[PDB]
């Protein structure tokens, strides 16, 4: 009766019937509590042409607690660090059972198009972003070609 299983199965079925643009998700391994997700960098972002792999790990009391979502693909972005951790409100404080992995994936896409420099996980990138956007995009593009293509 502690089963997050039904909620996960329902989300999976809903997401796969109506997937967020630029995104894909499916179960991975034996673990029903693990999904892999994929994000194709949006056209109007420094990450276009790039393919980013993410892990989705559901806690055992999901959806009372948010899913653990992390990039496995290396990325140059103020809100994502070298461990692939994502600084995003709805993955922490602003989570609620009303949200979904689908909605989080959409927000990550939004974050790729419009980094939030006021929420730096990576200080020096956040300022290259605010100080010189043109060099930021240059670096973001270079890292996409190098690690996400």
Partner 1 sequence: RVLQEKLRKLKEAMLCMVCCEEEINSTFCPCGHTVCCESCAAQLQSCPVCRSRVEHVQHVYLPTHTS
Q: Would you say 50 or 67 has its CB closer to partner 1?
A: 67
Kindly state the smallest distance separating residue 94's Cβ from partner 1, in Å.
Answer: 9
User: Of 59, 21, 15, 58, nearest to 40 (Cα)?
Assistant: 21
- Order of strands, edge to edge, in the sheet holding 51-57? 23-27, 34-40, 51-57, 68-71
Tracing tokens 């792999």 back to the chain, one arrives at 53
Kindly state the smallest distance separating residue 98's Cβ from partner 1, in Å.
Answer: 4
Alpha carbon 77 to its chain's center:
12
H or E element at residue 68 = strand 68-71
Contact positions toward partner 1, by CB under 8 A?
A: 3, 6-7, 9-10, 63-64, 96-98
Q: Is 113 noted as a catalytic residue in this protein?
A: no
User: Active-site residue among 23, 87, 109, 113?
Assistant: 87
Kindly state the smallest distance separating residue 84's Cβ from partner 1, in Å.
Answer: 27
Q: Would you say 83 or 96 has its CB closer to partner 1?
A: 96
- Cite the active site residues: 87
């Amino acid at each position: 009766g502690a089963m997050a299983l039904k909620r996960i199965q329902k989300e999976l079925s809903d997401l796969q019937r109506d997937p967020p643009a630029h995104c894909s998700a499916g179960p991975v391994g034996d673990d029903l509590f693990h999904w892999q997700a994929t994000i194709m960098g949006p056209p109007d972002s420094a990450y276009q042409g790039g393919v980013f792999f993410l892990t989705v790990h559901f806690p055992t009391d999901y959806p009372f607690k948010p899913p653990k979502i992390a990039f496995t693909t290396k990325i140059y972005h103020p809100n994502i660090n070298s461990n692939g951790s994502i600084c995003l409100d709805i993955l922490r404080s602003q989570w609620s059972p009303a949200l979904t992995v689908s909605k989080v994936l959409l927000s990550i896409c939004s974050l790729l198009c419009d980094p939030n420099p006021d929420d730096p996980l990576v200080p020096d990138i956040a300022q290259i972003y605010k100080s010189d956007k043109e060099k930021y995009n240059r670096h973001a593009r270079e890292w996409t070609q190098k690690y996400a293509m």
